[PDB]
Amino acid sequence: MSSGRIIQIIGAVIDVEFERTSVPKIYDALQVDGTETTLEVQQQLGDGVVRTIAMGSTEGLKRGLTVTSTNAPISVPVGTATLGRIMDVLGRPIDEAGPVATEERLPIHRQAPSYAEQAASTDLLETGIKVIDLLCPFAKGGKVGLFGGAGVGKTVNMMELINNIAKAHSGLSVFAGVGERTREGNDFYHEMKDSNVLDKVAMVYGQMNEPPGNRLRVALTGLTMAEYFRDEKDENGKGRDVLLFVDNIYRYTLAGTEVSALLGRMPSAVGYQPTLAEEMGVLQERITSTKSGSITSIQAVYVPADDLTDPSPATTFAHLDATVVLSRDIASSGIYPAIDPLDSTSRQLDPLVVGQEHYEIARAVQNVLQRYKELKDIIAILGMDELAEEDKLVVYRARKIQRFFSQPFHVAEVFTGAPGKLVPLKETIRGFKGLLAGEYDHIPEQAFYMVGGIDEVIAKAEKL
């Protein structure tokens, strides 16, 4: 018969026996016959008995209660209507916007793309954030870890990213909240709501309070979302590219460690799920650019124990295509975005990749900034007077670079009425290389604050 009954449960573990003729395969959906609790097939304990974890609470439930199968893994709806809705792990409405209209659903646990499906080329992913555009340029199917503390508009940063991707290239965006600090999630919802960006992104949060399994699986949930969206192709083929932001995959690792303990198998060397690398690859290699269409992913990450030798960041670095860090003092200097420009690094920093001239200009700029940091200490301890003249020029020009980095945003535009800044590559570089000639030493550093292109800078200098 197509259902079984509860035979034993401990902790988060559930056991049910079946007949030998009907027993599901792994990951298939199992609904508790009598409540809304759902069970995920994990491994076959034999004797008609199989082990599963329930999605949701563990009470209200006692042995002998029947539980059925769907003989299929978790299938959650996919469609354009998914935008603007916040859903549970099971893709069930939690914004109280009614049930999702789209009944077109797809399975989750699915195979990574083929070798043939590996996009045969690599090319620079673009955006409007000059420091991103130059100091850490991205590529489609990109994976960058984010670093920093709290109080810098990380959310705001993402908002501008989504606005730009939906504007320039109509690239879609989805977010997954893993271990969300519920209040912060609500606040972020309101924030993305006042901004009309709400309509352009799909929302599911895994609140840390939940049973660790669903918290684990929300990742693949949003992953499948993005897969469908990119594979959702307009005319002429070549569907749009999609963007994914993942909330602190470190929390995901923690949940994996939890559930690893839950099965009651071996805790690893430092103590982790030993299979962590495999599920890493499950995540990563399922995300890239395709032969037609791409999905790029930007992921929050916290470093436990502030160490770079514990396993989690080590495994993480196997996939971080670039490094982006946020510095507190930079925000304290009113510089926005408050990204530390000098130390965030991109693997995609080769003249082979970024372009020869582009590479040279970037190298020179970072050299200048490095020099300036070597200088400002001697300045403060000895006054700006005691420097060589070229040293002073470097000081002023680098500070001009920092000011030029300061820019308003279209997200800031609604926040405080002021036209946002949109700037591509080869638009920044012209002004930068001109600055390398020192042709703006007459131009005050103030003429670079909260400004877009170098033409706008010179216009400001005119009005100033």
Partner: protein, 506 residues
Amino acid sequence: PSEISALIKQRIGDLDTSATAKNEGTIVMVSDGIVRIHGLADAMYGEMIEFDGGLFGMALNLEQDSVGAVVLGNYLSLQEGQKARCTGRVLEVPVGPELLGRVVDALGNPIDGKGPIDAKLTDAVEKVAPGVIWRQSVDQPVQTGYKSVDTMIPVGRGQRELIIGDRQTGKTAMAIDAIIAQKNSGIKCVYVAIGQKQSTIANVVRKLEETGAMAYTTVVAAAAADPAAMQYLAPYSGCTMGEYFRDRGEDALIIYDDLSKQAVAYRQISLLLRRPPGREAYPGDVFYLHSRLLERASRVSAEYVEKFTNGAVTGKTGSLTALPIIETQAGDVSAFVPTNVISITDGQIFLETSLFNAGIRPAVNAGISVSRVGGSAQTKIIKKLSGGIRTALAQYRELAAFAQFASDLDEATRKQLEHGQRVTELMKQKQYAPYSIADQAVSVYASNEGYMADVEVKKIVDFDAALIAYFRSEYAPLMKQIDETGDYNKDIEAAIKAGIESFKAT
């Protein structure tokens, strides 16, 4: 059209012509591609195991009443009670020159999607090392297209030599260059991808076919997402394919990439068998587990060839050269697995983080990087020109180290420092910049002759390249002659210094 019809008809008239006697064992327990099977007694340890799903298995535990085994691939379409038969035959893999220009499954199945290829020979993967009475001293060079490498750290045919460094510090690019060097040599070269990103994979590929190297070349891959079994097993298979030509008196070359992933994957798998671990979750045999594979590469006797091919050859000594890869966490050379592997290799190379951070590409920590064989493969020119220069610069390193908290420097220390600076700047090259022998030959000549302690610090490399141009333009027959031989004569160096003065005049 109809040709496929005739082919399929005759292939159908071919086989399945009769029933077969066989033995089955059905599933009992399953977890993570690791299964418990009961009912097969005729089984072989680690044999191929038949399954209705079309996949196969390798046998692990011959207990009294069942067997545990390992999947080869994913297993989500599997469940207890299904049918599971035995091949009665050990693990193998197709091997042949046909593998050239192809990249396939870790079980030799074309992932390139360029048609399946038959290999009239197939060989068991797990094999033992040859006999000591058949080994041959390493006597033949291998060129790396480098100045730093080829000179200070010689590597000959058949030597094993680990490469160790950090992330994005230049670990592979080096092996790649070495392979590209072997283009003209025509030696056997083959590399294995082991648990890395397919993006990186296709990058390597596209580079290779760009070079056109992927015609005397074969590579197989273990994807980072593939279930750990293939990661564990693949390097053995690659060694198996490589040994084919060494088994034919033909020098061979293998490149192992990131054995650390394979090591940890095996650790995990074996631990899932609940076996007790040793230090940092590693079981003890891991040392053996890798080393047994490593010993399979060596330079052997033509006598061994005859004992292998029993008339099918005239008898020439064969060899296989080993390129393993292990990463170091925070530059911990004393790390456990590194300590294990260094005890195995015939030598090692380590790359310094800061110099690559300082832009020195490559960035050698020559301080600890040595070969047990050393001067048994270098050309007489190279061997005589080298010999202590690596030691000299190593001591220059520690001199500079001591020379920062003391203000006194004698003229010995002064000269050592100033010449170390020049020779340091002398050991630079570009990515994909190979060298003919005369290149580094004239460079080191100039260095030893103090012909560099005289010219501008920065202009060193410019002088070097312009010198190469100067000579290979004017002296092209000269360097052609010298690099075609590898032998030095004094009149040759007379011509060299004549060119030295002429170019210094320019």
